[PDB]
Amino acid sequence: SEWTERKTADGKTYYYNNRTLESTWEKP
């Protein structure tokens, strides 16, 4: 488990990063 791919009710799969505390919306 490296990146959190979770679906927010907005209909978006947001990649939230709690490892370094960063919000990523574009997959590296």
Swiss-Prot record:
Function: Transcription factor that binds RNA polymerase II and inhibits the elongation of transcripts from target promoters. Regulates transcription elongation in a TATA box-dependent manner. Necessary for TAT-dependent activation of the human immunodeficiency virus type 1 (HIV-1) promoter.
Tissue specificity field: Detected in brain neurons.
UniProt name for this protein: Transcription elongation regulator 1
Induction: Up-regulated in brain tissue from patients with Huntington disease.
Taxonomic source organism: Homo sapiens
Included range, full protein: 433 to 460 of 1098
TM segment ranges: none
Subunit-level organization: Binds formin. Interacts (via the second WW domain) with TREX1 (via proline-rich region). Binds RNA polymerase II, HD and SF1.
Entry remark concerning the domains of this protein: The FF domains bind the phosphorylated C-terminus of the largest subunit of RNA polymerase II, probably mediate interaction with HTATSF1 and preferentially bind peptides with the consensus sequence [DE](2-5)-[FWY]-[DE](2-5).
Localization, UniProt: Nucleus
WW domain boundaries: 1-28
Domain of life per record: Eukaryota
